[PDB]
Structure 1
Amino acid sequence: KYDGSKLRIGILHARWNRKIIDALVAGAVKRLQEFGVKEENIIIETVPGSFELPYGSKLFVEKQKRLGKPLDAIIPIGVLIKGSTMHFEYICDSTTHQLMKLNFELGIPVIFGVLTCLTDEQAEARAGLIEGKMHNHGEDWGAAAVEMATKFN
């Protein structure tokens, strides 16, 4: 239904919880390929943590413009696990809100690719790392990116 061959898609991912992140990125990449998005047009860049996702996304989008290779959509990818402090709550809160607002500031679809889990098992399951359980959410984010960049043209 959706054609991604003409699109350039950016994936910006954190490096905290790298094992789970890698699996999510791979899924997003996989689904992008299935929609016809060219390999040269899947751009992957990293940031340290999820807090750096929103501003990192802006800087990433702006750099791509300056390069003459603008992005049609972006998938910020982060994994946050509930720890002992309230750090989890406040990172999740601020990140989710800014990424949402970033749809309008940037003028391109920003797909919420942040997992917000209470356990490591929960994040692993939603990254496809536990076999026979659930699915890789990265794949959904890939499909969402193509559609949102296409549907309303």
Structure 2
Amino acid sequence: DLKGPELRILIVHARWNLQAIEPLVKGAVETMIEKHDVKLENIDIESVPGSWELPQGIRASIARNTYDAVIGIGVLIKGSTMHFEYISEAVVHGLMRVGLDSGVPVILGLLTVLNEEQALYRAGLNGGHNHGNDWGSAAVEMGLKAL
């Protein structure tokens, strides 16, 4: 039972596919507060237009304030072009780079799905499990293991 009452957590989420995003953020937040004793005031929630802006939004923010862990949340859905494949690959490498450059743990809350249904399912709707909960716990653990 890892508890982190003094942890400061940053959550940056995109706004594309908001119906999937919200449940995810909510799940992450609730899990941190109700199961890890993270204080609501210690959780900054910011947003960016799309998943492409995620790495950049996170970099800008951890350069201004101090956080123990960050969760980047976005939802990319495969469309008719190759856009999905290239953005996904670039965003994932980007998130990894910002975390390794900064030394701050960056939790991956990015869904790269084939359709809307797959995303809602992983957001806890239609019988699925909310992955945001798993992300919230990972943030806490990684924040503590960094001291």
Q: TM-score, normalised by structure 1?
A: 0.92
- What is the aligned counterpart of 1:124 among 106, 109, 120? 120
Deviations 1:33-54 (A, max 9, x none): 0211111101000000000000
Give the Cα separation in 2 of the matches to 1:147 and 1:128.
22
SS at match of 1:10: strand
Question: What is the CA distance between 1:134 and its match in structure 2?
Answer: 2.5
Q: Is the 8 A contact 2:28 2:134 kept in 1?
A: yes
User: Residue 100 of structure 1 aligns with which residue?
Assistant: 96
Q: Flag as ranges the 4+ runs of structure 1 deviating above 2 A.
A: none
Question: What is the CA distance between 1:115 and its match in structure 2?
Answer: 0.3
Give the Cα separation in 2 of the matches to 1:129 and 1:106.
35
Q: Is the 8 A contact 2:68 2:146 kept in 1?
A: no
Give the Cα separation in 1 of the matches to 2:119 and 2:40.
27
User: Residue 19 of structure 1 aligns with which residue?
Assistant: 19
Q: Which has the higher strand share?
A: 2
User: Residue 43 of structure 2 aligns with which residue?
Assistant: 42
Superposed, 1:53-92 pairs within 5 Å as 53-64=54-65, 70-92=66-88
- What is the aligned counterpart of 2:138 among 127, 133, 144? 144
**Aligned pairs, number:** 146
Give the Cα separation in 2 of the matches to 1:106 and 1:2.
24
Give the Cα separation in 1 of the matches to 2:87 and 2:116.
17
Give the counterpart letter for 2:76 in structure 1.
L
Share of identical aligned residues, percent? 55
Give the Cα separation in 2 of the matches to 1:17 and 1:106.
29
Question: What is the CA distance between 1:3 and its match in structure 2?
Answer: 1.5
Give the Cα separation in 2 of the matches to 1:88 and 1:77.
16
Asked if 1:111 is matched to 2:107, the reply is yes
Question: What is the CA distance between 1:152 and its match in structure 2?
Answer: 4.9
Give the Cα separation in 2 of the matches to 1:124 and 1:152.
32
Deviations 1:17-68 (A, max 9, x none): 011101100001011102111111010000000000001100011122xxxx
SS at match of 1:76: strand
Q: Gaps spanning 5+ residues in structure 2: where? A: none
Give the Cα separation in 2 of the matches to 1:107 and 1:49.
24
